[PDB]
Structure 1
Amino acid sequence: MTTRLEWAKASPDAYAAMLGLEKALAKAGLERPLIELVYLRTSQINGCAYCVNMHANDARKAGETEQRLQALCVWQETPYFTPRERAALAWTEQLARLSQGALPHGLLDELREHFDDKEIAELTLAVSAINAWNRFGVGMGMQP
């Protein structure tokens, strides 16, 4: 990492609070490989190069396949993802671009074809946290 402002040095509290997001999802029932896809697809949408690099590397270390890794930015028209992963990425895409308009009503319905309500909160936790990391990532000018 290179950065324009060492935000964990300047505010240990903020850094500790953000780790708390990670600590809660580390405990989550939701699969780590799904979460990695959510982190990776979100960081791509948000243009956070540090987080893209980080989370591609982690998904790959856990053996994520180069085929799914390269195709994730265009997942909709690929045969590579399960209906469960696809519902979670639809959620991810829409919630990454929340500034752009209303979220479709039936999206949460589609999720619950594939996930229980606890998984959905954990999923939304993951979206929420990466969107948070990306904002420090890009705002503080961090680079891989």
Structure 2
Amino acid sequence: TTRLEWAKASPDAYAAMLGLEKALAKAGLERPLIELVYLRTSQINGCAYCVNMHANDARKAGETEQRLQALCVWQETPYFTPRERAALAWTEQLARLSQGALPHGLLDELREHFDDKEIAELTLAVSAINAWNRFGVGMGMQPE
């Protein structure tokens, strides 16, 4: 289930990572949207531990099986709102940041759906799950 118990090795790193979650917990950004961002990022990054945790946490936040099964192919479905689709486009592009430039009008399109405080919180969410995925995959973590 893990190859390295990293939170025990560096309690400071674990505390710092929990600080990201504390900030997000205080954010106005709605929790079901954060869970989608987390689940989709974890899918893209191939972090099975995080996929399992956030599919489970998304259900805790009220999500349906229809949405959870469609998330990996969200672009070609009618299940996600204009606001969610904006956030998921952001999520996908930032997950794949090593692969090339972000399109010019992307932030501008996000601004049609989110105020700037929400954008900061959304980007924190994206950054945090990207960070958790790196610990998850790196330390060789497996679900159940």
Give TM-score, length-normalised by structure 1. Answer: 0.99
Q: Cα RMSD between the aligned structures?
A: 0.4
* Corresponding residue number in structure 2 for 1:105: 104
SS of match in other structure, 1:86: helix
Compute the displacement of 1:128 (Å). Answer: 0.2
Distance 1:35 1:52 in 2: 13
**After superposition, what is the alpha-carbon deviation per residue over 1:27-70, rounded to whole angstroms, capped at 9, x for unaligned?**
00000000000000000000000000000000012210100000
Distance 2:77 2:62 in 1: 19
1:13 pairs with 2:12: yes
Compute the displacement of 1:105 (Å). Answer: 1.2
**After superposition, what is the alpha-carbon deviation per residue over 1:80-119, rounded to whole angstroms, capped at 9, x for unaligned?**
0000000000000000000000001111011100000000
Distance 1:83 1:105 in 2: 19
Same amino acid, percent of matched pairs: 100
Stretches of structure 1 lacking an aligned partner (at least 5 in a row): none
Which stretches of structure 1, 4 residues or more, deviate above 4 A after TM superposition? none
Distance 1:109 1:3 in 2: 41
Distance 1:125 1:5 in 2: 26
SS of match in other structure, 1:132: helix
Distance 1:105 1:66 in 2: 34
Distance 1:96 1:43 in 2: 9
Distance 2:60 2:28 in 1: 20
Stretches of structure 2 lacking an aligned partner (at least 5 in a row): none
